[PDB]
């Protein structure tokens, strides 16, 4: 019927002055643009159909051609920034915003999707969609007593569009826009659908990836507790965006980081630091390094939750990048920790793994390791046990590693390397 139409035939039918013939050609185009592979987006654009599709968006009398052109334009806008730009250049943004108020829910949902594709292109298209006034109508669609009264697909699409309105930086979404959507995003973050929960966590992760003022707007909304609950989830698609948002919040103030700790976050890291997904281990280890850069009571919280042996494990065996984050966590712990905490680290077995990572090619990981070694040695001086730490480093072979670091390409590496060798390994 309308399958496998030539763009020429689609152009012939759309250029008819027969609304029904245009609907047939607009549906044939949607099918071409909805096929499994190689949607001829460029061919559709060059035929000059985007303007016709945007004009069809306004056919209140022909809701079919409104839905057909919505889908075609959605899939065009799904492509490169060039093709999205073509859709936006056709005056599609205001037309889709108008369709958001359609009584046909599939037409409304298609407009939601199209706006999601536009806004997801980048920060400029995101702010342009916002300026055209899409937040009010989009949030009006979710103004129900129970979101469970909404179609699973409808809800998922609205959440994914809202996540795209909270995504992208340079600049971050307008503060007013984030404050107008944050309340509805918190309700979707408490929804029961795994896809709505992951997209909501990804929206919250986008909002928390910026200055401490942004982190505060989200933390003030009181989402950290549900984020920690979603951090425990069995779905990696939900645990991934949850850990990122928690990590983003622990990049902020020590009070924002203490809000995470109070919510029970540290109790999930035993699993996140042993998680089979390398990306989860890395991000958890980077959240731990930012937690050990905090106050001493916060380091003591880390210690009380048994997380130091887990950092030792990660430093002993884990993806190099995870190990680099772990070396950072150790250097932060030892820079800000009490002498009692620093000694707890060496009792947990941090010396051998740390000294074994000194044989790494990365120069920055060696500088970070040498930094922690010096901080622990400084704590050892306070106890008069530096000799025992020197004996521990010489036994694990790390003394040889430092000795060789004295000929390293970097100045700081051999500079700090020679200092410790002529400070705790000299007569």
């Amino acid at each position: 019927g309308t399958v496998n139409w030539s763009v020429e035939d689609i152009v012939k039918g759309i250029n008819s002055n027969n609304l029904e013939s245009q609907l047939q050609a607009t549906q044939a185009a949607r099918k071409l643009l909805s096929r499994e592979k190689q949607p001829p987006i460029d061919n559709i654009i060059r035929a000059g159909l985007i303007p016709k599709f945007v004009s069809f968006l306004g056919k209140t009398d022909c809701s079919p051609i409104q839905f057909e052109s919505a889908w075609a334009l959605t899939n065009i806008a799904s492509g490169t920034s060039e093709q999205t730009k073509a859709v936006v250049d056709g005056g599609a943004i205001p037309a889709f915003i108008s369709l958001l108020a359609s009584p046909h829910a599939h037409i409304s949902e298609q407009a939601v999707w199209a706006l999601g594709n536009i806004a997801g292109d980048g920060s400029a298209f995101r702010d342009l969609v916002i300026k055209h006034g899409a937040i009010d109508p989009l949030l009006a669609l979710l103004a129900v007593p129970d979101l469970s009264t909404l179609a699973c697909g409808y809800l998922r699409n609205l959440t994914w569009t809202l996540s795209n309105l909270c995504r992208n930086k340079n600049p971050a979404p307008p503060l007013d826009a984030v404050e107008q959507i944050l309340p509805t995003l918190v309700r979707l973050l408490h929804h029961n659908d795994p896809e709505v929960l992951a997209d909501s966590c990804w929206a919250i992760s986008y909002l928390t990836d910026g200055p401490n003022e942004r982190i505060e707007m989200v933390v003030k909304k009181g989402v950290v507790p549900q984020l920690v609950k979603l951090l425990g989830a069995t779905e990696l698609p939900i645990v991934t965006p949850a850990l990122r948002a928690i990590g983003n919040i622990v990049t902020g103030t020590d009070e924002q980081t203490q809000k995470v700790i109070d919510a029970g976050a540290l109790a999930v890291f035993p699993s996140l630091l042993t998680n089979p997904k390398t990306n989860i281990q890395k991000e958890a280890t980077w959240t731990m390094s930012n937690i050990t850069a905090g106050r001493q009571d916060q380091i003591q919280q880390v210690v009380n939750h048994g997380l130091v042996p887990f950092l030792v494990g990660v430093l002993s065996k884990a993806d190099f990048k995870t190990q680099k984050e772990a070396a950072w966590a150790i250097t932060n712990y030892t820079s800000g920790g009490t002498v009692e905490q620093i000694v707890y680290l060496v009792h947990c077995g941090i010396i051998e793994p740390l000294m074994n990572l000194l044989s790494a090619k990365d120069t920055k990981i060696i500088q970070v390791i040498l930094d922690a070694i010096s901080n622990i040695f400084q704590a050892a001086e306070k106890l008069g046990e530096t000799e025992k730490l020197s004996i521990m480093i010489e036994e694990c072979g790390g003394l040889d590693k430092i000795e060789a670091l004295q000929r390293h390409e970097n100045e700081s590496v051999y500079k700090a390397s020679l200092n410790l060798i002529e400070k705790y390994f000299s007569v």
Binding site: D209, G247, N248, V250, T251, G252, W286, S289, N290, T292, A293, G294, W328, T331, N332, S335, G336
Partner: peptide
């Protein structure tokens, strides 16, 4: 010592 994305 806090490092951001």
């Amino acid at each position: 010592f806090k490092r951001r994305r």
